[PDB]
Design a protein around this nucleic acid. Structure first.
Ligand SMILES: [Ca+2]
Ligand code: NA
Ligand code: NA
Length: 316
DNA sequence: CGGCAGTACTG
DNA sequence: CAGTAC
DNA sequence: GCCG
């Protein structure tokens, strides 16, 4: 696996500092570089050998900094606000600009957020389940959640099928997220069961809190009935059968996977989002793009000129 | 240099 | 409009 | 942050 973890560690700390400080691109380059250093077959030996890794000049300059020295000195200049901002980012619905606001307001602890800090409804639901949301769950409990949502959905219409796309479907032992995709094979009967099932599950108590409540997209908190059960974040999306193959890809993950798939689709003049695979829109543009039917996940790998990758092989 | 995904919700 | 989310 |  990671043959250069002594450097990937210190760089993941640097990338975290950038991610916590609004520099999404600095963090994205760092993460793509750690994801490349962790997947490389042999450990690094020189600067030349480091830069040839698809790693730049200043990144391999840090690789060589940790290869010749034992501690990267960039880390010594990291701002002391980085931990506080990261802590505020650990709250749901709270990112770099809200952590920055809380920080300049003199807040330096979660208790300060729960006492004097102004919170939104979502930032409150995140602040109350702070520990649970950071404790990823075993695959078995995610399966319990999946089957529970599927059974309750099938009671409204037995034709409906469900799938727990996400790190679970990728085969990851832990999952601090549960995204259940529900659809109907005909693509027309699905319309109208979202609210009924959502109220059903909240009535029984499967759902504890609600975050983003849209017509087609549900985001909230669930908790399996039983002792010592921690609150897990669940999303329930009811998209038509036509778009199911384009949705199941994105909601399977990872993000970096759908980022490389989106780049590859863009080079071949195609837009690959979580709703449909369309080709290049007319060009300022003088027209939208043309949808390409892709019923199965292989059809999407096909129209993109790529071999089918198993969900297990989607960490990119 | 300049692009790195586009989207819906919430406020 | 922006912020945070997938 | 890297790379076309
Ligand atoms: Ca996830
Ligand atoms: Na966060
Ligand atoms: Na339980």
């Amino acid at each position: 696996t990671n043959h250069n973890l002594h450097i990937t560690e210190k760089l993941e700390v640097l990338a975290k500092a950038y991610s916590v400080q609004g520099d999404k691109w600095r963090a994205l380059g760092y993460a793509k570089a750690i994801n490349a250093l962790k997947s490389f077959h042999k450990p690094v030996t020189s600067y030349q050998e480091a830069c040839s890794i698809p790693i730049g000049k200043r990144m391999a300059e840090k690789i060589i900094e940790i290869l010749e020295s034992g501690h990267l000195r960039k880390l010594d200049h990291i701002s002391e606000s980085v931990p506080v901002l990261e802590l505020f980012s650990n709250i749901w619905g709270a990112g770099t600009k809200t952590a920055q606001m809380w920080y300049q307001q003199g807040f330096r602890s979660l208790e300060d957020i729960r006492s004097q800090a102004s919170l939104t409804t979502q930032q409150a639901i995140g602040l109350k389940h702070y520990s649970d949301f950071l404790e990823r769950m075993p695959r078995e409990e995610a399966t319990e959640i999946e089957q529970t949502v599927q059974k309750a959905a099938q009671a409204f219409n037995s034709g409906l099928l469900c799938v727990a796309c996400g790190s679970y479907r990728r085969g990851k032992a832990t999952c601090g997220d549960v995204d259940v995709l529900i659809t109907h094979p005909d693509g027309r009967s699905h319309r109208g069961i979202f609210s009924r099932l959502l109220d059903s599950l909240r009535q029984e108590g499967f759902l504890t809190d609600d975050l983003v409540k849209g017509e087609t997209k549900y985001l909230g908190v669930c908790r399996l009935p039983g002792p010592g059960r921690r609150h897990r974040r669940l999303d329930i999306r009811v998209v038509p059968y036509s778009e199911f193959a384009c949705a199941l890809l994105y909601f399977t993950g990872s993000a970096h996977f759908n980022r490389s798939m989106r780049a590859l689709a863009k080079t071949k003049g195609m837009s690959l989002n979580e709703y449909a695979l369309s080709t290049a829109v007319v060009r300022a543009k003088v027209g939208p793009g043309r949808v390409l039917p892709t019923p199965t996940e292989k059809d999407v790998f096909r129209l993109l000129g790529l071999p089918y990758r198993e969900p297990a092989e989607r960490d990119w």
